[PDB]
Amino acid sequence: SPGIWQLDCTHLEGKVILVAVHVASGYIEAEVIPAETGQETAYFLLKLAGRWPVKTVHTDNGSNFTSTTVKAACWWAGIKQMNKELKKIIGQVRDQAEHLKTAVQMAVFIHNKKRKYSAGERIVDIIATDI
Amino acid sequence: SPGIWQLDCTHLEGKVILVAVHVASGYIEAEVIPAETGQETAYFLLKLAGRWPVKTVHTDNGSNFTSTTVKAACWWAGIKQMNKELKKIIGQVRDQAEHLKTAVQMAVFIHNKKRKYSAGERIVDIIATDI
Ligand SMILES: Cc1ccc(C2CC2)c(-c2ccc3c(c2)CCCO3)c1[C@H](OC(C)(C)C)C(=O)O
Ligand SMILES: Cc1ccc(C2CC2)c(-c2ccc3c(c2)CCCO3)c1[C@H](OC(C)(C)C)C(=O)O
Ligand SMILES: [Mg+2]
Ligand SMILES: [Mg+2]
């Protein structure tokens, strides 16, 4: 279903990478955050929900979503309730950039543009077809 | 044309808001940054280019794009070279959030979802039709 996203954090070089996957397409958005806090998750959810029609979010660590701030973001935005493949690409490009966050965005770019159509093409088509 | 984006910064409460507009659709993405630096622009461009097929970027301040770092981001990602309407929405929601960045993302959400189809629906349809 086109409104379903998966959200998890993974750890690399002492930092935290927030990873959202549009399950139907494999399309990813990621951000490096200082550490795993409800406030960072909430803010990320608000950002994500303004870009895509986010209906439901799943996670592999349900305690991620217990904070008052996360609950508020989901309430306002109308939301109801690959780490290895992305880490692979990050490793392939890591030497080309100083900052981990730079390498993360290169890896998201490479993943979303890779033809199996690409994840970036699939999400756009899935969402348009739903309209 | 579906690959064209506009990128500018605007100022509010002593902070800097980076605003990207998909010109064909009116769809917006925004981020609050500390101040206007080439590095922040470069990083934003890398993020944007992994989400959408960004072909060309325009700006109203051409000196925005002179830094070595911006040029590198455009090179790697294959890129070649409303402030009032968004400030209006930010003012309408500003009291509901502590942080300006939170109010900015609420305003992006409201803008992209507003039916004139919405900007969010238009960009997804324009991009899918181009495929
Ligand atoms: C810190 C820094 C300094 C200089 C550059 C470019 C040669 C000028 C880049 C950079 C700029 C763009 C770029 C890549 C690297 C690698 C390929 C993708 O595009 C970065 C970069 O940090 C940001 C925050 C992005 C400026 C990094 O972490 O090394
Ligand atoms: C700093 C802070 C504290 C508490 C909350 C929620 C009641 C718990 C929110 C919040 C959380 C979600 C939310 C809105 C506000 C307003 C409507 C949209 O959704 C924020 C918030 O900061 C972030 C970084 C987002 C946590 C802010 O700037 O006030
Ligand atoms: Mg997690
Ligand atoms: Mg500007």
User: In percent, how much strand structure appears in the residues of chain A?
Assistant: 15-25%
By CATH reckoning, the class of chain A would read: Alpha Beta
> What oligomeric state do these chains adopt?
homodimer
Which fold does the CATH topology of chain A refer to?
Answer: Nucleotidyltransferase, domain 5
Largest interface: A-B, 28 and 28 residues
User: Which term fits the overall shape of chain A?
Assistant: flat
PDB class: viral protein
Keywords: integrase, HIV-1, viral protein
Assembly: dimeric
Entry title: Biological and structural analysis of new potent Integrase-LEDGF allosteric HIV-1 inhibitors
Question: Can you tell me about this structure?
Answer:
The structure is a homodimer of 131-residue chains. Chain A is an alpha+beta fold and 131 residues long. Chain A has a single domain, classed as Nucleotidyltransferase, domain 5 (2-Layer Sandwich), CATH 3.30.420. Chain A has five helices and four strands, in the order E-E-E-H-E-H-H-H-H. A four-stranded mixed beta sheet of chain A has the order 3-2-1-4, sandwiched between helices. The radius of gyration of chain A is 15 Å and the shape is flat. The interface between A and B is medium-sized, with 28 and 28 residues. One copy of the ligand Cc1ccc(C2CC2)c(-c2ccc3c(c2)CCCO3)c1[C@H](OC(C)(C)C)C(=O)O sits at the interface of chains A and B.
